[PDB]
Amino acid sequence: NLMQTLKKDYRLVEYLQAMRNFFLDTMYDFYTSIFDQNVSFLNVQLQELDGLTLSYKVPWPVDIVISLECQKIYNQVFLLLLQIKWAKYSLDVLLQIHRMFLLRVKLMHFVNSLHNYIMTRILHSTGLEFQHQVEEAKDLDQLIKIHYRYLSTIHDRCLLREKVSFVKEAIMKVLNLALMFADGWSIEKMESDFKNCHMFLVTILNKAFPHLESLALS
Amino acid sequence: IPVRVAEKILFVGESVQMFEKNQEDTFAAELHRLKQQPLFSLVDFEQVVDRIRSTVAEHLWKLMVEESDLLGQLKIIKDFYLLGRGELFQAFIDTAQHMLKTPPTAVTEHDVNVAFQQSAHKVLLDDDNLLPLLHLTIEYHGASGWAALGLSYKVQWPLHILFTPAVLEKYNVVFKYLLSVRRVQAELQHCWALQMQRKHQTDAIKWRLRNHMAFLVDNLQYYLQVDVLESQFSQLLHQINSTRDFESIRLAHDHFLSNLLAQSFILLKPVFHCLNEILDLCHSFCSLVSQNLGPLDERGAAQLSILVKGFSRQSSLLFKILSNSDLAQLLLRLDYNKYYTQ
Amino acid sequence: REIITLQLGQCGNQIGFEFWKQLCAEHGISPEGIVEEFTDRKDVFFYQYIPRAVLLRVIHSILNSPYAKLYGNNWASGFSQGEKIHEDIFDIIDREADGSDSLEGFVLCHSIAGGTGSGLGSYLLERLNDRYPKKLVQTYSVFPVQPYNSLLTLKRLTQNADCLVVLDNTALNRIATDRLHIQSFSQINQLVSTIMSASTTTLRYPGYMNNDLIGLIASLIPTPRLHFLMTGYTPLTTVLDVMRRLLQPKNVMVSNHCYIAILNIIQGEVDPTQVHKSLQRIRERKLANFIPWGPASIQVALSRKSPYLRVSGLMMANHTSISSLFERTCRQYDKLRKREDNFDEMDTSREIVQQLIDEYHAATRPDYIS
Amino acid sequence: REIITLQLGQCGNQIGFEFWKQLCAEHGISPEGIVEEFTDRKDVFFYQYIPRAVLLRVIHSILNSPYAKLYGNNWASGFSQGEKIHEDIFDIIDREADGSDSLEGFVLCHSIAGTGSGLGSYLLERLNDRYPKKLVQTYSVFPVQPYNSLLTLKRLTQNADCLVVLDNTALNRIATDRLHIQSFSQINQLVSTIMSASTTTLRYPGYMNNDLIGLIASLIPTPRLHFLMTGYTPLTTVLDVMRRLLQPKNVMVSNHCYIAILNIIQGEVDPTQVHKSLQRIRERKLANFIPWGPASIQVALSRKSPYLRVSGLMMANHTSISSLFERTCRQYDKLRKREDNFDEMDTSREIVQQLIDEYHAATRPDYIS
Numbered sequence A: 001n002l003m004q005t006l007k008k009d010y011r012l013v014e015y016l017q018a019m020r021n022f023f024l025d026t027m028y029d030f031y032t033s034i035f036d037q038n039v040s041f042l043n044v045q046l047q048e049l050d051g052l053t054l055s056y057k058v059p060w061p062v063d064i065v066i067s068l069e070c071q072k073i074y075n076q077v078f079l080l081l082l083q084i085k086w087a088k089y090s091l092d093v094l095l096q097i098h099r100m101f102l103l104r105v106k107l108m109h110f111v112n113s114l115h116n117y118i119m120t121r122i123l124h125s126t127g128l129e130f131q132h133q134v135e136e137a138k139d140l141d142q143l144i145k146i147h148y149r150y151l152s153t154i155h156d157r158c159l160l161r162e163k164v165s166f167v168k169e170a171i172m173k174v175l176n177l178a179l180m181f182a183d184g185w186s187i188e189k190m191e192s193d194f195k196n197c198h199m200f201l202v203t204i205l206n207k208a209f210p211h212l213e214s215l216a217l218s
Numbered sequence B: 001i002p003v004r005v006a007e008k009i010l011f012v013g014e015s016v017q018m019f020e021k022n023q024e025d026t027f028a029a030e031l032h033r034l035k036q037q038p039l040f041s042l043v044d045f046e047q048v049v050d051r052i053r054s055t056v057a058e059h060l061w062k063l064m065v066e067e068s069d070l071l072g073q074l075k076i077i078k079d080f081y082l083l084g085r086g087e088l089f090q091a092f093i094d095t096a097q098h099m100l101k102t103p104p105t106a107v108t109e110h111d112v113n114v115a116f117q118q119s120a121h122k123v124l125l126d127d128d129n130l131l132p133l134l135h136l137t138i139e140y141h142g143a144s145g146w147a148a149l150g151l152s153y154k155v156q157w158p159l160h161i162l163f164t165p166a167v168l169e170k171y172n173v174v175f176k177y178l179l180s181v182r183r184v185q186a187e188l189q190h191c192w193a194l195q196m197q198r199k200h201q202t203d204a205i206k207w208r209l210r211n212h213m214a215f216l217v218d219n220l221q222y223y224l225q226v227d228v229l230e231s232q233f234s235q236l237l238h239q240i241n242s243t244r245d246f247e248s249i250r251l252a253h254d255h256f257l258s259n260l261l262a263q264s265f266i267l268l269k270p271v272f273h274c275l276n277e278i279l280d281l282c283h284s285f286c287s288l289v290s291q292n293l294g295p296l297d298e299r300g301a302a303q304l305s306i307l308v309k310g311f312s313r314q315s316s317l318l319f320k321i322l323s324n325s326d327l328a329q330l331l332l333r334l335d336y337n338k339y340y341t342q
Numbered sequence C: 001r002e003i004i005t006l007q008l009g010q011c012g013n014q015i016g017f018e019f020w021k022q023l024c025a026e027h028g029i030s031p032e033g034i035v036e037e038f039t040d041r042k043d044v045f046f047y048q049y050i051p052r053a054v055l056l057r058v059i060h061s062i063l064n065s066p067y068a069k070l071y072g073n074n075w076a077s078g079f080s081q082g083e084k085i086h087e088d089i090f091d092i093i094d095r096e097a098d099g100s101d102s103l104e105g106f107v108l109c110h111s112i113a114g115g116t117g118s119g120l121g122s123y124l125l126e127r128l129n130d131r132y133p134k135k136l137v138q139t140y141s142v143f144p145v146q147p148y149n150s151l152l153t154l155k156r157l158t159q160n161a162d163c164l165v166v167l168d169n170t171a172l173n174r175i176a177t178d179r180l181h182i183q184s185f186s187q188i189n190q191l192v193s194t195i196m197s198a199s200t201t202t203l204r205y206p207g208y209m210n211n212d213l214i215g216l217i218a219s220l221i222p223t224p225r226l227h228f229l230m231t232g233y234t235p236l237t238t239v240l241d242v243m244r245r246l247l248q249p250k251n252v253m254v255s256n257h258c259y260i261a262i263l264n265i266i267q268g269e270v271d272p273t274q275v276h277k278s279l280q281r282i283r284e285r286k287l288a289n290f291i292p293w294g295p296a297s298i299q300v301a302l303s304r305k306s307p308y309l310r311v312s313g314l315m316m317a318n319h320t321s322i323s324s325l326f327e328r329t330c331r332q333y334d335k336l337r338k339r340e341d342n343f344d345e346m347d348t349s350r351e352i353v354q355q356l357i358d359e360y361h362a363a364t365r366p367d368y369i370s
Numbered sequence D: 001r002e003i004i005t006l007q008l009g010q011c012g013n014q015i016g017f018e019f020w021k022q023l024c025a026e027h028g029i030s031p032e033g034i035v036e037e038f039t040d041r042k043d044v045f046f047y048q049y050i051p052r053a054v055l056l057r058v059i060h061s062i063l064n065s066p067y068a069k070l071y072g073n074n075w076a077s078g079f080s081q082g083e084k085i086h087e088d089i090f091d092i093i094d095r096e097a098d099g100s101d102s103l104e105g106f107v108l109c110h111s112i113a114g115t116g117s118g119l120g121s122y123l124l125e126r127l128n129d130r131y132p133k134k135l136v137q138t139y140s141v142f143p144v145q146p147y148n149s150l151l152t153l154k155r156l157t158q159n160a161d162c163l164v165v166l167d168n169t170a171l172n173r174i175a176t177d178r179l180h181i182q183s184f185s186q187i188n189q190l191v192s193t194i195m196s197a198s199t200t201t202l203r204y205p206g207y208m209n210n211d212l213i214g215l216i217a218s219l220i221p222t223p224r225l226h227f228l229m230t231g232y233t234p235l236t237t238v239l240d241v242m243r244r245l246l247q248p249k250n251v252m253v254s255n256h257c258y259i260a261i262l263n264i265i266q267g268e269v270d271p272t273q274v275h276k277s278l279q280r281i282r283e284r285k286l287a288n289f290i291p292w293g294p295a296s297i298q299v300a301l302s303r304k305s306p307y308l309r310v311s312g313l314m315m316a317n318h319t320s321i322s323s324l325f326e327r328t329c330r331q332y333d334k335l336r337k338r339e340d341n342f343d344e345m346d347t348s349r350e351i352v353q354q355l356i357d358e359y360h361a362a363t364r365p366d367y368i369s
């Protein structure tokens, strides 16, 4: 009965679907304005390097499900996702002279491949399974568990919890190449770095726990 | 027994006492049938009372509208209490202006009632009905006159169950705040007509560069009011024409008024304490420019430079207060993206 | 607070009658100026029923209409006549002022191109500022030897008329062909009356604000120089639907650049809750450019259509692109100056209008102040 | 961020109208431009509903259709007539460009086979003049004709931001093979399907590819190599689709290698099997890429119109497109020595020679320098 009157009209399930939707279209126009700050400027933009803490308002009937320490994890993946959209869009909005373009495809590929991995293979695989699971909710408690077994696993596949200075930092430092090369628009000294860090990336990730091979091809 | 159904009972009884076919015997037998049930089931006690409430309310709604021209009284309320007939109150201010700026005394109570009565006849609005029901009061001996002005309404008998002196009290508070902003915009518009009249000093432009600035802070503050009055009123007028129950009216109307205290930024102290300073600060400005016929030379320009040092800060101060419903106010204030520079 | 209306010139006397037959039709007023049986505040334009009009060959055409009981071509020639009937007409004007309770403004309908208008309309604006100094003088002037009559008049409208609305016949004749398919004067005037009628909608019906002519103009004109406006009439359905058609220059009667302030008038029964939703998407799309120097906003107002007679719409625009129309005229003026008692008044008039076009071109800069 | 369409000549007006037919058929918009009761963000391709269409003899035919509520033969001939109405048409563009909140692109449907090729040549040089921050994509259609064709190439080689070839001969082949017709009114039925399915990710929002610049720039390695060819086999798992796509029987083009592949999947397929399909494509190695740059294949998921079964579209950047140019090029050298300055025709022949000579070098292990 509760779920029935919650599709229209304390629909906890309806609120949950919107949650993972207003981040992870609409949010495309939002970030593009940030590319070209102030704390009130953003709000009117939203209502229309690593910060932007986002929160939301949840009614008591669903407060027990979407806890307070649950907001931060949902915020954690949102921060990292934007940096990927940033590098992906920064190298995309523009259009030994032509030699720079060979450094573009050699790079615009790599960030693009990673983005195809986090969103599709992870942020849409477990998402498709999670919805098929919540529709069979039969308990107050287990609905927390099926939910808590969705964040603590999506925070592991997306490598953000541990092995950060061992693996995650590598993707982080090469992301700085997406910033440096974007502004300039020394060239030889980039591929010496790029061919090194990229090989550093594969020769480190080569230890593969098993799901990392879906990107290890490149 | 829940307190809700207790509110239903008292209404049906008072509505017949004040009132002094087939709807009588049927209610008797139902009351008697309940006494034979060896179990008092609360789900059934309400099942018969809710029909009786909706029965006397339906017939009363007929007498309150069709023969006697609840909706009609509500329209009168929205007019005079909520400044619905705003044109009447600008001519009322034009006449009852000098007899209110001085501190109020025991005679100004009646000195203004003849002005208000003269105001309704001044806009050819003539009705011996509903005119003597509005008697302006002055809270005297327990300060400018506007700080004690009030408007009372003598409710009829059938509507006394819905209009207690308490609900007519919260209405009175709104009438004071809405009349205040309507007063400052009027005298401010007169200043606009004073600069335009003075078409042919280098410092003479500093007035309108601040006047037109201080005009948008009040005019837009005076907007969002038709977008909160003519909108909430559109819902309350809908809630009655949909439900046949009387309890719905007593809660929807009580809910309708509660929004006016919140949406109109009255209960929230900070927004109520910030724009409050814009009111009396503007009084000094419009008075200063009207208190002279030439340029502000003898320390007048030395006085204008004092308010701008306070007002311009308050402009950015409210900009920080904004950054639930303030978007409906900030959208109009920043559609031109000027406050982004402050 | 009543508004006495004056009508001069053939064009002015013609549009007024079509403005009058339109207004009395919206109310329950018979052509015999008597109420018919069939809330609407009717005091602003009518005296207790007679309209507060002063009409100044064409008069015969008006008295022959069933509305009878309702009451040369050179700039120098028109003015000379004015000073000769100076005393005669003012007693007509003065008696109407004392008759009103609290006179507020002066609506005037005249054409700069019209000789009588270029001679008699110009003379009144100087006398009106002399006799009554505390009364606004707003005119519904309409742009069309022809350039001479135009520029000489603009010299007065920039210092006497504290407000003004321009109606260009070129764009009007254009709109007649594309969306009306007429090809005369008798057809284009139909749309002219629609503008003036909806322009004074908020005054004739009791509302919350906008209960005086000052209530509309003061938000538009910030400075005594920037005193030119423009109109736009869309219907020739939600609140967001009507606004997107306003800002299109395809309907505005006109032939960087940015506005100053916008006033929107809605005559329908639309739900007033979603109007704040419409403005948000407009700011998101950024369909109109604004001034960065001073605080400005976009406004909207609601009213009720005449029941005795569906959503309409009228917009009041203060655009700097209107300066171009002046340049075109003054350009032709300089063209006739080099091809053809003192010939000096026409010289200073060219200089003072140079300040106006300068003020607008300097208004679209981040440093318009000083 | 919206995209405005422009239909030029009999061809462009024909292909656009049918495309606007099916697009209005897919969306829940009745032919009378009135919403039907019966999830889709349509502000990019519709204005509140009137399409942002700029049409340019066939005008009578469009009006005669019940969709009236929805709004010589020389190349130098078209070029002259375009300057004559320079401000005549650009006011319609400007009233809509400035009438659009934030314009994003410029799609063009035109045939370079008579006057639309000349007028189209006029728009490109003109659009680059005024709008420097606006994308220009052209859905040009290919087959005295060699002349008009080669000039439009010279203009399209440096003006347009992208290009999608649509040759009639290859389209003529599909007309008989899988349809058994032998008609102009029938071949375009596929062209509209090619157009509509191309922008499905933009009309139905998803996670990736929320802007047209997001799709194209993944393919184009350098602004010189901005020529694309498409694929549409469905006329079944994710692996069945892509393998059906690489067969040259389906490609709409009449050593060599690819540059990059972008795929569109519109069915109800599962995102669990797509990453494995790419592997079997690599292991079995049904296609080769450039030897210099590490090339990738991309594929996107979408949602079919509910108001309307697994279908798919393929976009390709294949260096075999050079052969198509060389044919008309040979045809030009044929009529040049066979029959007031006649000098611009040589300038066009020089630049198109550059692009071809870059194709042949683009597929070599030493594309650098």
Ligand SMILES: Nc1nc2c(ncn2[C@@H]2O[C@H](COP(=O)(O)OP(=O)(O)O)[C@@H](O)[C@H]2O)c(=O)[nH]1
Pocket (backbone or CB within 6 Å): C009, C010, C011, C014, C015, C072, C073, C111, C113, C114, C115, C116, C117, C142, C143, C144, C169, C185, C186, C189, C192
């Ligand atoms: N909009 C409009 N303009 C008019 C009308 N009648 C005349 N005009 C304008 O008046 C100008 C001609 O002036 P004219 O009537 O000869 O002046 P008069 O000889 O002093 O009356 C033309 O340029 C017209 O644009 C009318 O009915 N409507």
Ligand SMILES: Nc1nc2c(ncn2[C@@H]2O[C@H](COP(=O)(O)OP(=O)(O)O)[C@@H](O)[C@H]2O)c(=O)[nH]1
Pocket (backbone or CB within 6 Å): D008, D009, D010, D011, D014, D015, D072, D073, D111, D113, D114, D115, D116, D117, D141, D143, D168, D171, D184, D185, D187, D188
């Ligand atoms: N595939 C295809 N080609 C077309 C169609 N309509 C016209 N064409 C081509 O367009 C060319 C003629 O273009 P034309 O009518 O002269 O363009 P215009 O000079 O601008 O009017 C021919 O070579 C046709 O092959 C169509 O519906 N489908």
